């Protein structure tokens, strides 16, 4: 009657406190099948995973594979929160508690991948005492490895204790001698000219040019440890100078991750050290192969364009001390490109990472009037949506209606930019204020406002439930490709009240009833006064003002006066839309 | 001066700070006595006169420094002065806050109900102790590891099991051993039961034991053992890892000894960065 996919849907829709009965209800799948429990944990959230682990600790004997799948699910959630941009990261305390439960249930039986996943989960929280304790616990058991040292140096990347991470990297280089120079030299192969950079994006046969994914993890640890290190010893060490020279002249990886590593790497450097490093590398790589500050970037760009259009104009944009400097870097450098015969590079300003860099430089300065000039001019493109979520918040603090709804309907919706919960809460309030202004003057449709809450919505969780037939199986062939069932979108009750007021002021109370049913279906969010709101909407649909007043008087005589204040506000918002 | 305040209560002259009396300024204890106005009049030290018992005057001002109020149990006259002076002056309402219901607080008393299930067939016993605590916060994983270490030296694990079933409930069985061996297990469990609660800061106030008759067709009894504790205390080791629900060891081992622990490869091994002696 029920499948495993419907059981996973019931698990992912139920809250965290309901993990204990359902595990005890369908316990015939978990008491003897560890692979079934691992598949349940991997297809569910990390909080539900640790709830199921805490429930099964009192009933079954959990294995090391259960905690391994839990740490893998937490690492996948960290990868998703890196990719998407909304939601919170996995806390280091929950990962340490899971590792402590696994080390108290199974002593000296966990693999080193458990410690590796624990260090990778403690890496974004920058908790290095946890890494020191894990290294001491692994050394006391005589199992101390070199990728654990790499991930502990990545954990110890912090402005407080960067010297311990540098000492860990020095001990890693003293133990294993050839991994670090080969991983650095993978960013600069022998025999690389501008024609190789052209053929990497033009020609066929996408060969692997040398960096392995383990070398990519090592380089990410090096990027974190050079972001944490100050600029004084970063320009004196051979390793740091080699990495800074090989990152700006990589030409082997995609420009998005190169731009990300360049934004993270050169942050602690000052402006003069940055421009002298860029001048030195532009001298050596072009001599081997071949205010006043706004003038100093023009001579930096015109000597360094073999297919280096994407990362450099974002790195110099991030290294500028202010956002008006970034606006001048957008305007006067485009004018110099028109002056210095640079028609080919200006097609790369419409790349989404450049406007994302400009919007981030405007967002960290909290400048919405500067961001609106970039919003209304350029074409709508895929924003990485960490900055567009707080730009709508910063536009809401100005308490002005038309610009927010204008940029939402002309830049965010056609580019498919997915906002956070508070951003949509601010945008629906601005839409409601602009619709009330348009109603009192005499343009958001209510169906469009319903679709902007469901289609335009981003959660920090990742859909991972597969269908029953769409799974790589050990027996028989698959009929369909592996498809992921999308989770139904959950709505906060502030979004519920804003959608109710929008569908009332639009003139169609059916949309409010549909939104209330969708909210009761996806998350069981019932309002405290919804039994009166349903009848108010039914009186609105059939034009019954006397019954709408009598139900308000009955809610006043039943509930409090402040509860009937919302019903009176809804009545006076309906009366201006009916008139 | 704004530093010293001299209050003469019952002939005894005590020295205090202006921050002590004006720690709760909204009370009538502080607003009725103008300490900054008396400091401008008397430049040396403020002088006030109170009519209280001098031993009670040490109790109220001693509460302002240590943030703990202890009332005398025997002397009911002095006990009645603290509840009257702090009510008239307004210090009583700020002393005991009424709260309406993350940290966990241990209760004042603690009862432990143990429900045994006995079976006796000609000189052997068979126990099933259901240890149950009274509230949350009691670490029963520390309790069971006190039971498992002391009982492994006496008897093998093929005759008894012990695991945790809830946050405030434990469990222990005994599979058909003699009366000299079963009373050895039951007395060792109930001694580690109270010694775990003595380490939490409690003391055994009272206890009793209850034995039930047989069921009408079987030789099954129900021994009820109840305890009662009270709040007495006023508030690089070795990891011994064990699973919660244990597994039985009947006959030979199905998996070898080296297949239990996990080892890293030799090429991945690094030198120790901390000293080992």
């Amino acid at each position: 009657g029920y499948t495993f996919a419907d059981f996973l849907r019931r698990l992912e829709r139920s809250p965290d406190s309901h993990m204990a009965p359902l595990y005890h209800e369908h316990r015939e799948l978990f008491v003897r099948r560890h692979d079934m429990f691992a598949r349940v944990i991997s297809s569910v959230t990390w909080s539900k995973g640790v709830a199921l682990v805490a429930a099964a600790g009192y009933t079954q004997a959990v294995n090391v594979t259960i905690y391994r799948a839990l740490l893998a699910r937490m690492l996948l959630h960290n990868r998703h929160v890196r990719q998407c941009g909304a939601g919170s990261v996995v806390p280091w305390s929950a990962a340490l508690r899971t590792y402590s439960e696994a080390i108290a249930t199974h002593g000296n039986a966990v693999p080193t991948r458990m410690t590796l996943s624990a260090l990778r989960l403690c890496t974004p929280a920058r908790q290095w005492v946890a890494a020191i304790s894990l290294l001491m616990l692994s050394q006391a058991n005589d199992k101390l490895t070199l990728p654990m040292l790499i991930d502990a140096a990545g954990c110890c990347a912090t402005p407080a204790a960067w010297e311990k991470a540098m000492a860990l990297l020095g001990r890693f280089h003293a133990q294993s001698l050839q991994v670090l120079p080969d991983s650095i030299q993978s960013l600069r192969p022998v025999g690389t000219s501008a024609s190789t950079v052209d053929a990497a994006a033009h020609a066929l046969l996408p060969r692997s040019e040398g960096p392995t994914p383990e070398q990519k993890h090592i380089l990410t640890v090096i990027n974190k440890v050079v972001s944490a290190v100050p600029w004084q010893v970063a320009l004196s060490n051979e390793m740091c100078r080699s990495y800074l020279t090989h990152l700006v002249a990589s030409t082997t990886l995609r420009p998005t991750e190169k731009t990300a590593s360049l934004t993270t790497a050169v942050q602690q450097l000052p402006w003069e050290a940055f421009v002298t490093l860029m001048k030195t590398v532009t001298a050596t790589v072009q001599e081997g192969s071949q205010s006043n500050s706004i003038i100093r970037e023009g001579v930096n760009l015109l000597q360094s364009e073999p297919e280096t259009a994407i990362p450099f104009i974002t790195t110099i944009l991030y290294k500028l001390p202010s956002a008006e400097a970034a606006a001048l870097f957008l305007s006067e450098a485009t004018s110099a490109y028109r002056n210095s015969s640079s028609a080919v590079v200006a097609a790369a300003i419409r790349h989404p990472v450049v406007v994302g860099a400009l919007l981030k430089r405007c967002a960290d300065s909290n400048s919405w009037y500067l961001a609106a000039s970039i919003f209304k001019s350029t074409s709508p493109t895929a924003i990485p949506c960490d900055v567009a979520s707080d730009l709508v918040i910063q536009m809401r603090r100005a308490n002005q209606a038309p610009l927010v709804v204008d940029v939402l309907q002309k830049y965010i919706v056609p580019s498919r930019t997915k906002l956070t919960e508070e951003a949509i809460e601010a945008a629906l309030l601005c839409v409601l204020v602009h619709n009330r202004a348009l109603a009192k003057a005499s343009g958001v449709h209510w169906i469009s406002a319903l679709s902007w809450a469901t289609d335009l919505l981003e959660e920090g969780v990742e859909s991972r439930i597969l269908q029953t037939g769409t799974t790589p199986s050990v027996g028989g062939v698959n009929h369909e490709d592996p498809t992921v069932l999308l989770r139904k979108k959950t709505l906060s009750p502030r979004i519920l009240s804003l959608l109710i007021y929008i569908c009332v002021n639009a003139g169609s109370p059916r949309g409010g009833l549909f939104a209330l049913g969708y909210a009761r279906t996806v998350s069981k969010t019932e309002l405290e006064l919804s039994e009166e709101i349903t009848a108010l909407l039914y009186c609105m649909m059939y034009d019954r003002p006397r019954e709408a007043e009598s139900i308000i008087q009955h809610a006043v005589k039943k509930h409090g006066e402040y509860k009937g204040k919302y019903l009176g506000r809804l009545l006076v918002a309906s009366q201006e839309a009916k008139g | 001066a704004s530093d010293r305040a001299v209050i003469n209560a019952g002939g005894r002259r005590f020295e205090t700070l202006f921050s002590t009396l004006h720690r709760y300024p909204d009370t009538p204890f502080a607003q009725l006595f103008p300490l900054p106005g008396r400091g401008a009049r008397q430049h040396r030290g403020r002088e006030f006169f109170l009519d209280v018992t001098p031993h009670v005057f040490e109790y109220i001002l001693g509460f302002l420094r240590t943030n703990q109020l202890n009332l005398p149990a025997e002397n009911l006259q002095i006990r009645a002065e603290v509840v009257y002076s702090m009510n008239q002056w307004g210090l009583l309402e700020h002393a005991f806050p009424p709260e309406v219901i993350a940290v966990v607080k241990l209760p004042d008393v603690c009862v432990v109900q143990v429900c045994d299930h006995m079976q006796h067939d000609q000189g052997v016993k068979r126990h099933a102790l259901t240890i149950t605590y009274g509230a949350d916060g009691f670490q029963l994983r520390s309790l069971i590891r006190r039971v498992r270490r002391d009982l492994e030296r006496q008897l093998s694990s093929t005759y008894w099991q012990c695991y945790q079933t809830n946050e405030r409930a434990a469990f222990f069985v005994t599979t058909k051993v003699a009366n000299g061996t079963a009373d050895l297990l039951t007395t060792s469990v109930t001694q580690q039961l109270v010694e775990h609660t003595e380490s939490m800061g409690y003391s055994l106030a009272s206890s009793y034991v209850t034995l039930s008759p047989d069921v009408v067709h079987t030789s099954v009894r129900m021994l009820i053992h109840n305890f009662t504790f009270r709040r007495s205390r006023r508030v690089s080791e070795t990891i011994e890892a064990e699973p919660n629900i244990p597994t039985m060891h009947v006959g030979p081992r199905r998996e070898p000894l080296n297949a239990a622990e996990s080892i890293p490869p030799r090429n991945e091994r690094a030198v120790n960065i901390w000293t080992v002696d």
């Binding site: 000296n108 001491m136 616990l137 | 270490r149 492994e152 690089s236 070795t238 011994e240 064990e242 901390w274």
Partner: peptide, 16 residues
Amino acid sequence: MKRIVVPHRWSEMNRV
């Protein structure tokens, strides 16, 4: 620095 060892059973302590 915590060394993790397995607690011995009665068949392991009194092995003959």
